Design a protein around this motif. Structure first.
Motif, PDB file in Angstrom:
ATOM      1  N   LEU A  95       0.859  -1.166   0.000  1.00 29.02           N
ATOM      2  CA  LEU A  95       0.000   0.000   0.000  1.00 29.02           C
ATOM      3  C   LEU A  95       0.899   1.219   0.000  1.00 29.02           C
TER       4      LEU A  95
ATOM      5  N   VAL B 172      -2.255  -4.970   0.753  1.00 30.08           N
ATOM      6  CA  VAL B 172      -3.632  -5.336   0.460  1.00 30.08           C
ATOM      7  C   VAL B 172      -4.031  -6.582   1.244  1.00 30.08           C
TER       8      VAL B 172
ATOM      9  N   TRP C 297      -6.991  -7.160   4.302  1.00 40.70           N
ATOM     10  CA  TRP C 297      -8.067  -8.161   4.329  1.00 40.70           C
ATOM     11  C   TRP C 297      -8.022  -9.098   5.503  1.00 40.70           C
TER      12      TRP C 297
ATOM     13  N   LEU D  56     -16.973   0.020   4.192  1.00 41.57           N
ATOM     14  CA  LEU D  56     -16.044  -0.741   3.358  1.00 41.57           C
ATOM     15  C   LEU D  56     -15.555   0.096   2.170  1.00 41.57           C
ATOM     16  N   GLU D  57     -16.464   0.807   1.512  1.00 44.83           N
ATOM     17  CA  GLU D  57     -16.091   1.652   0.373  1.00 44.83           C
ATOM     18  C   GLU D  57     -15.116   2.753   0.776  1.00 44.83           C
TER      19      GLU D  57
ATOM     20  N   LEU E 244     -11.677   1.376   1.214  1.00 44.46           N
ATOM     21  CA  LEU E 244     -11.115   1.168  -0.127  1.00 44.46           C
ATOM     22  C   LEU E 244     -10.560   2.460  -0.734  1.00 44.46           C
TER      23      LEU E 244
ATOM     24  N   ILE F 120      -7.201   3.185   1.416  1.00 43.48           N
ATOM     25  CA  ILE F 120      -6.048   2.318   1.146  1.00 43.48           C
ATOM     26  C   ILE F 120      -5.637   2.301  -0.328  1.00 43.48           C
ATOM     27  N   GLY F 121      -6.615   2.452  -1.215  1.00 42.33           N
ATOM     28  CA  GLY F 121      -6.335   2.481  -2.652  1.00 42.33           C
ATOM     29  C   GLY F 121      -5.862   3.835  -3.151  1.00 42.33           C
ATOM     30  N   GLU F 122      -5.789   4.810  -2.250  1.00 45.31           N
ATOM     31  CA  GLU F 122      -5.448   6.189  -2.610  1.00 45.31           C
ATOM     32  C   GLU F 122      -6.350   6.761  -3.721  1.00 45.31           C
TER      33      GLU F 122
ATOM     34  N   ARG G  53     -18.128   7.742  -5.305  1.00 47.35           N
ATOM     35  CA  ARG G  53     -17.750   6.393  -4.884  1.00 47.35           C
ATOM     36  C   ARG G  53     -18.800   5.748  -3.986  1.00 47.35           C
TER      37      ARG G  53
END
Ligand SMILES: C[n+]1cn([C@@H]2O[C@H](COP(=O)(O)OP(=O)(O)OP(=O)(O)O)[C@@H](O)[C@H]2O)c2cc(N)[nH]c(=O)c21
Lengths: 12, 188
Positions: free
Chosen positions: B13, B43, B47, B105-106, B109, B112-114, B160
């Motif tokens: 990440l 990642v 999880w 959750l979104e 995301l 962490i996903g930038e 998003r």
């Protein structure tokens, strides 16, 4: 820089 | 010849993130009830943490989760939070069942996903409050005067989350939150 889409992330 | 990284390496990440848990206990200070769970920076480790912990909808009301950049405490008083503020999602009582876990959750995301591209450095972390009168989710950013960054983040986040133009979400500074009763600096 590391960017991940939601679909990529959800695959894990 | 060495092995192919793709076959055995975890997916790094951009940032290390720390997950915090808050449990309400009346006898203690707000700060005292805030506790670190666990950090991660891949990642896979994300999880592993997510999959073994309770969904927000199952938490006892009064409890929070907070995902924050390593070295940023999930409190106004942190250096990176003091001049900052939050995009706030306000959920009605029925939305605990339908939206809460999905939206949280979104949010993780996005973090962490930038998902905030050029403005990733403005993002401090996010908070979900589980509350009887209505659950809240929020992204915390570092500087409430950074209109370009704050506004970009709001726009990305709303889309998003899939919220329609009629649903208005606001951004308040923490300085206002800490020091006044429940105006928005920006809406999206
Ligand atoms: C995020 N936060 C919350 N609090 C304390 O916790 C109280 C409740 O705030 P909070 O959990 O964010 O929101 P709630 O839905 O429980 O209460 P409400 O004010 O939004 O009706 C708040 O009024 C403060 O006294 C804090 C106190 C601090 N000194 N620093 C904080 O970051 C901080």
């Amino acid at each position: 820089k590391k960017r991940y889409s939601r679909e990529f992330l959800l695959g894990f | 010849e060495v092995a192919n990284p793709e076959h055995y390496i975890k997916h790094p990440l951009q940032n290390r993130w720390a997950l915090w848990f808050f449990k309400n206990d009346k006898s203690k200070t707000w700060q005292a009830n805030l506790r670190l769970i666990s950090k991660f920076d891949t990642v896979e480790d994300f999880w592993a943490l997510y999959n073994h912990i309770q969904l927000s909808s199952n938490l006892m009301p009064g409890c929070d989760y907070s995902l924050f950049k390593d070295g940023i405490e999930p409190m106004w008083e942190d250096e990176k939070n003091k001049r900052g503020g939050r995009w706030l999602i306000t959920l009605n009582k029925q939305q605990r069942r339908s939206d809460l876990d999905r939206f949280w959750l979104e949010t993780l995301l996005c973090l962490i996903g930038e998902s905030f591209d050029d403005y990733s450095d403005d993002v401090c972390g996010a908070v979900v409050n589980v509350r009887a009168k209505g659950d809240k989710i929020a992204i915390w950013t570092t500087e409430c005067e950074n209109r370009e960054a704050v506004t970009h983040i709001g726009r990305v986040y709303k889309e998003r989350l899939g919220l329609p133009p009629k649903i208005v979400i606001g951004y308040q500074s923490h300085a206002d939150t800490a020091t006044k009763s429940g105006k928005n600096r920006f809406v999206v």
